């Protein structure tokens, strides 16, 4: 009998229990409306009557009503399990404002009635998951991008930086340069398909001009996607454009850092002394860092950031994309942490606004 770790992000809902490796129940982060109640895989192949919603935007929880009914799926549907026999450890975004994890409580210790519970910051989790205390995660999902400088398992509040670059944009990136290749992806089943092209096929440049250079000059870095009804789409220097977006947010006419300097920007507003371990700890997580390259594109492009000196290292962990839930799941099993929770009891004495001076 052990606990429950629920991570919920703007696209992908990722369920399970404390003491296991890997997420059990994982499905995007949908609420479909007919313009009665469908959550999960179950709501993508029924739109064309429904209306979707999401209500994670940015990291962050919009509506609390289509949030309550993910998690009534979560429990009963997709975990077949009830709340109040479990604790469960609820994920939240960096600089979550006070309020929505106060909010979140409440529907858990009161609509759920778990007998205790828990809210962690996501970034957090994932430095966990790969066995550090001190770092900078770089955790990018498909909503929201954030550098966290995190010490001692204390994130550091001055020195966050969220980027609203992130999967769907790069997605949509794609459509966009895809489409003045000829191509066309009107609909959301075609644009389902440019998801999985940018994850089959794209990759991050070493060298981002060398790079485009090279495919101008021949088709050396091209690669054919088979469409299900057998099309072959020739694909090229799209390939490493999408990702491109990230190190240069113009791209996409934004006037943003790239991830690259946002986790330079993030390190330089720390306390000195502490640097030299976040630079050399630096870790990604979130699914829209899986593109290969990415590693060595930002060793190569911190390092000409950084102290002439200085000593980087960009951590991959292979598993990454789904790291924040499994740095719970090893949180919420750890014998030590087992009386940190706060309880159904706790909570009745206190109320919600309790979650903050145990939850730090
Ligand atoms: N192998 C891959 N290569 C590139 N991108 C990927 C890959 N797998 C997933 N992604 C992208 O990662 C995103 C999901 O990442 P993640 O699970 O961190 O999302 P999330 O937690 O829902 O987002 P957020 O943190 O923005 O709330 C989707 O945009 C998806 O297109
Ligand atoms: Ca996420």
């Known amino acids: 009998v052990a606990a429950l770790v629920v991570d919920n992000g703007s696209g992908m809902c990722k369920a399970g229990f404390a003491g296991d490796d890997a997420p059990r129940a994982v499905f995007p982060s949908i609420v479909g409306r007919p313009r009665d109640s469908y959550v999960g895989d179950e709501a993508q192949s029924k739109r064309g009557i429904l209306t979707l919603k999401y209500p994670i935007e940015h990291g962050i929880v919009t509506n609390w009503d289509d949030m309550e009914k993910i998690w009534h799926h979560t429990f009963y549907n997709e975990l077949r399990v009830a709340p109040?026999?479990?604790?469960?450890?609820?994920?939240?975004?960096?600089?979550?404002?006070?309020?929505?994890?106060?909010?979140?409580?409440?529907?858990?210790?009161?609509?759920?009635?778990?007998?205790?519970?828990?809210?962690?910051?996501?970034?957090?989790?994932?430095?966990?998951?790969?066995?550090?205390?001190?770092?900078?995660?770089?955790?990018?999902?498909?909503?929201?991008?954030?550098?966290?400088?995190?010490?001692?398992?204390?994130?550091?509040?001055?020195?966050?930086?969220?980027?609203?670059?992130?999967?769907?944009?790069?997605?949509?990136?794609?459509?966009?340069?895809?489409?003045?290749?000829?191509?066309?992806?009107?609909?959301?089943?075609?644009?389902?398909?440019?998801?999985?092209?940018?994850?089959?096929?794209?990759?991050?440049?070493?060298?981002?001009?060398?790079?485009?250079?090279?495919?101008?000059?021949?088709?050396?870095?091209?690669?054919?996607?088979?469409?299900?009804d057998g099309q072959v789409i020739t694909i090229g220097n799209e390939r490493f454009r999408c990702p491109e977006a990230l190190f240069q947010p113009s791209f996409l006419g934004m006037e943003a850092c790239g991830i690259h300097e946002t986790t330079y920007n993030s390190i330089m507003k720390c306390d000195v002394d502490i640097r030299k371990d976040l630079y050399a700890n630096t870790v990604l997580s979130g699914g829209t860092t899986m593109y290969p390259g990415i590693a060595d594109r930002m060793q190569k492009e911190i390092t000409a950031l950084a102290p002439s000196t200085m000593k980087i290292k960009i951590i991959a962990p292979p598993e990454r994309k789904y790291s924040v839930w499994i740095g719970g799941s090893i949180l919420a099993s750890l014998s030590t942490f087992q009386q940190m929770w706060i309880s159904k009891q706790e909570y009745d004495e206190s109320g919600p606004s309790i979650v903050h001076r145990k939850c730090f």
């Open 84 to 228: 109040e026999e479990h604790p469960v450890l609820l994920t939240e975004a960096p600089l979550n404002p006070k309020a929505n994890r106060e909010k979140m409580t409440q529907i858990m210790f009161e609509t759920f009635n778990t007998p205790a519970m828990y809210v962690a910051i996501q970034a957090v989790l994932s430095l966990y998951a790969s066995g550090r205390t001190t770092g900078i995660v770089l955790d990018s999902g498909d909503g929201v991008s954030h550098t966290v400088p995190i010490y001692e398992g204390y994130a550091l509040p001055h020195a966050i930086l969220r980027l609203d670059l992130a999967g769907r944009d790069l997605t949509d990136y794609l459509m966009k340069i895809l489409t003045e290749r000829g191509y066309s992806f009107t609909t959301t089943e075609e644009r389902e398909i440019v998801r999985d092209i940018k994850e089959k096929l794209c990759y991050v440049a070493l060298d981002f001009e060398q790079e485009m250079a090279t495919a101008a000059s021949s088709s050396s870095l091209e690669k054919s996607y088979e469409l299900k």
